[PDB]
């Protein structure tokens, strides 16, 4: 039985880790029985809205329920986060930038 289990236990480890992590991260939103919708907020880059919509094209493709847009930008009074991109050739350079 060890021979058989070995093929799958390792995979299942990181698999189940993915589910626990995804459940946790989704759990940070607010929900109540009041509304069928889910109350959530998050912070999203602005130069990829079209890509976000296209990727949500799958949301309307197979699991479709016909509520495509979940994006509506409002304003706040707190400073936004700062972030940028990195590349393979610059693994070290970019790290020390924000270190």
């Amino acid at each position: 039985e060890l021979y058989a289990i070995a093929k799958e236990l390792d995979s299942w480890f990181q698999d189940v880790t993915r589910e626990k992590a995804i459940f946790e991260i989704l759990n940070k939103s607010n929900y109540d029985t009041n509304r069928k919708i889910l109350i959530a907020e998050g912070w999203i880059p602005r130069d990829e809205l079209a890509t976000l919509q296209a990727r949500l094209g799958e949301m309307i493709a197979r699991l479709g329920i016909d509520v495509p847009s979940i994006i509506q930008v409002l304003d706040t009074n707190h400073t936004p986060p700062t972030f940028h991109r990195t590349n393979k050739f610059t693994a070290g350079f970019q790290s020390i930038c924000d270190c």
Partner: protein, 452 residues
């Protein structure tokens, strides 16, 4: 006039309806050149004009003549659109609804004249007929009986290739059956279609998402079919006595609900299906024992109840319903005596698995009375095992042989006097995996606990 509209959810055929609404057929020629009564088209033009800037229902009487005298393959479309549209809003007319429930002569033969030729004309004519039937004072069973006995509908309901026409045809039936008056009537020849519906359900549970088979079908564009099918069953099952036979007629389909409750996520099916089974298992009917045990045997839904109980649901209905299901599912058999049933099953020569077979919490005082005959019956069972070759039979006995020591400590001596230890050693290498695995379990626990 004021009534209850029908067929709102469907969308594909709304445009088909609109196809002729935006058009206009040539009525003048029909009666102008020896094909229609010279007044039919003249007053038909006036009626069409009345559709705007006016709002008084006696002039609708002659259309019976027109449809009776109707001769062209599609001229009937204008009048059937009239029928389907005068109901679109209460603003139309002043004396429509009252007259239908008065004279049955016209209404009865409306069905007779229609239901021929084109698919779409048949569909819309049936829609108009049933919609008129919706209103109070319209309960003539003969119309629905003749509708059922005809093969014209099944000639298209069998079209597994297209799901739209079959959708609408099945859909109108639920509104037809809202009242029990027609559930029984349909039950006579109901068999023509529920095999098809169960095929639809089997395909649904067979949903292969690795290939595109839901083309334009999602986004409320085809999910409605199951939402209304399950409603049809929850409707026809409002009667216990009639609900009994089907459960005693088809087995696999009913068991398929456990698979159904797993694949999809949409709420439109969960509460619907669970209620059907809840009705199926109530003592309110005078049969609630024939199929429950086999449901437990092949079902093994015990893991599922907690799984769905823990998960997320905003509705206030299914939460208690699943608790009812669980309490009636486990208490019925898992909370039962064993020794009597144990003897009954062993004497029959039939050995299988059951909650009694593996359950142990309810085995704290069975062993003492298993020694009443000095284990005569159980040792004879062991002998038949020695003269048996059924792997399940081999495993089940050894299971309780092990349960002996697991519960009862001093029965080791009788086990020793059995002399089957060498036969257990022989069973070690028998071909089946399960038999030798369970035999190793039994012999290992015997030897280790023998000192224990």
């Amino acid at each position: 006039m004021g009534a209850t509209k029908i067929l709102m959810d469907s969308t594909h055929f709304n445009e088909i309806r609109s196809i002729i609404r935006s058009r206009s057929v040539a009525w003048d020629a029909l009666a102008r050149s020896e094909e229609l009564s010279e007044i039919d088209a003249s007053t038909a033009k006036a009626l069409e004009s009345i559709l705007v800037k006016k709002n008084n229902g006696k002039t609708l009487i002659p259309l019976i003549h027109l449809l009776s005298t109707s001769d062209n393959e599609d001229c009937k479309k204008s009048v059937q659109n009239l029928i389907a549209e005068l109901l679109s809003s209460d603003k139309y007319g002043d004396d429509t609804v009252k007259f239908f429930q008065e004279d049955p002569k016209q209404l009865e033969q409306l069905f007779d004249v229609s239901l021929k030729g084109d698919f779409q004309t048949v569909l819309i004519s049936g829609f108009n007929v049933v919609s008129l039937l919706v209103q109070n004072g319209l309960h003539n069973v003969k119309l629905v009986e003749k509708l059922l006995k005809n093969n014209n509908l099944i000639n298209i309901l069998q079209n597994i290739e297209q799901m739209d026409t079959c959708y609408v045809c099945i859909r109108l039936l639920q509104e037809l059956a809202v009242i029990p008056e027609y559930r029984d009537v349909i039950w006579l020849h109901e068999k023509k279609f529920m095999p098809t519906l169960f095929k639809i359900l089997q395909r649904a549970t067979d949903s292969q998402l690795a290939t595109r088979i839901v083309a334009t079908n999602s986004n409320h564009l085809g999910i409605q079919l199951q939402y209304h099918s399950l409603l049809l069953i929850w409707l026809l099952t409002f009667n216990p006595v009639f609900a009994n036979e089907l459960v005693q007629k088809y087995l696999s389909d009913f068991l398929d609900l456990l698979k159904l409750v797993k694949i999809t996520i949409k709420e439109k099916v969960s509460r619907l299906c669970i209620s059907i089974i809840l009705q199926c298992c109530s003592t309110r009917v005078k049969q609630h024992k024939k199929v429950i045990k086999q449901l437990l045997l092949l079902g093994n839904a015990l893991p599922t109840v907690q799984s769905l109980s823990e998960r997320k649901y905003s509705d206030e209905e299914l939460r208690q319903d699943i608790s009812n299901l669980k309490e009636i599912l486990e208490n019925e058999y898992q909370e039962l005596t064993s020794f009597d049933e144990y003897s009954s099953e062993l004497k029959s020569g039939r050995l299988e698995w059951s909650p009694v077979h593996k359950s142990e919490k309810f085995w704290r005082e069975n062993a003492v009375r298993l020694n009443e005959k000095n284990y005569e019956l159980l040792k004879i069972l062991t002998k038949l095992l020695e003269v048996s070759d059924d792997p399940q039979v081999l495993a089940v006995a050894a299971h309780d042989v092990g349960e002996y020591v697991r519960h009862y400590p001093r029965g080791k001596r009788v086990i020793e006097q059995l002399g089957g230890k060498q036969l257990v050693m022989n069973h070690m290498h028998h071909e089946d995996q399960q038999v030798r695995y369970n035999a190793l379990l039994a012999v290992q626990k015997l030897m280790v606990h023998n000192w224990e």
